[PDB]
Structure formats: structure tokens, C-alpha cells
């Protein structure tokens, strides 16, 4: 199936970010998708997410692991620009400004093997 960037045009994505940030100024707009070809981890039902500004990557990883109903022992990586974040205590509002895409979304992919 097509990725989010392939299902929505660039100009549609830009406009959506502008409008959703007006409506929810304390939330960060995040696209979360399963890594291409990943089979151990399941698919999320939705693609577009709103994350409160204060949530850090450690907390977000916990949230997503719970949403996927993962076992505590199994590997899981949340990749922002193809790599795991090591500064897991910084709030996502700060991650957003450094790592957002050209379209204004913050893109994440999750995988089960070597980040």
C-alpha cells in the first residue's frame, strides 16, 4: 500500500499541518507508520497522530508499545529520520522543530530490528 506522503499531496499536507496547528496549538502533528517490510510488529489502525508538547520520546515509545500490545521483552525502535533518538527526555515540541519534514509533519517509523 501507499505511504502517507503518496496518499496525500505535498500541498494538501502543508495545508493540513497549518490548520491542525491552529486548532490544537499544544499538540504536535506526527505521522507514525510501520517500517517497510516489517512483519513482527503489527500495523496501527491510524496514521495521523496528535502528541501533547510535553511528551518525550521515552514516553511516546511506551505509549506506542502499549497501543501495539507488545510483550515487554520484544525489540521495538521508533525512528525519526531513519534512526533512533538517544535524547529520549527532550519534549516532542522541541523534537518537532529540529526534525519536522518539509511539509510540517513529524514523521516516525517503527521497526523491530537494529533501529
Amino acid at each position: 500500500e501507499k505511504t502517507f506522503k503518496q496518499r496525500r499531496t505535498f500541498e494538501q499536507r502543508v495545508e493540513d499541518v497549518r490548520l491542525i496547528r491552529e486548532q490544537h496549538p499544544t499538540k504536535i502533528p506526527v505521522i507514525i507508520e510501520r517500517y517497510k517490510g516489517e512483519k513482527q510488529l503489527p500495523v496501527l489502525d491510524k496514521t495521523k497522530f496528535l502528541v501533547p508538547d510535553h511528551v518525550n520520546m521515552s514516553e511516546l515509545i511506551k505509549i506506542i508499545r502499549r497501543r501495539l500490545q507488545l510483550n515487554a521483552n520484544q525489540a521495538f525502535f521508533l525512528l525519526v529520520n531513519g534512526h533512533s533518538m538517544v535524547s529520549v527526555s527532550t519534549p516532542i515540541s522541541e523534537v518537532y522543530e529540529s526534525e519536522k519534514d518539509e511539509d510540517g509533519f513529524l514523521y516516525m517509523v517503527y521497526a523491530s530490528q537494529e533501529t
Partner: peptide, 9 residues
């Protein structure tokens, strides 16, 4: 098509 958002907290 699905334009909705899920809130993560």
C-alpha cells in the same frame, strides 16, 4: 478517506 487524528498521551 480518513482525515481524522488520534491523540497519543
Amino acid at each position: 478517506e480518513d482525515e481524522t487524528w488520534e491523540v497519543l498521551e
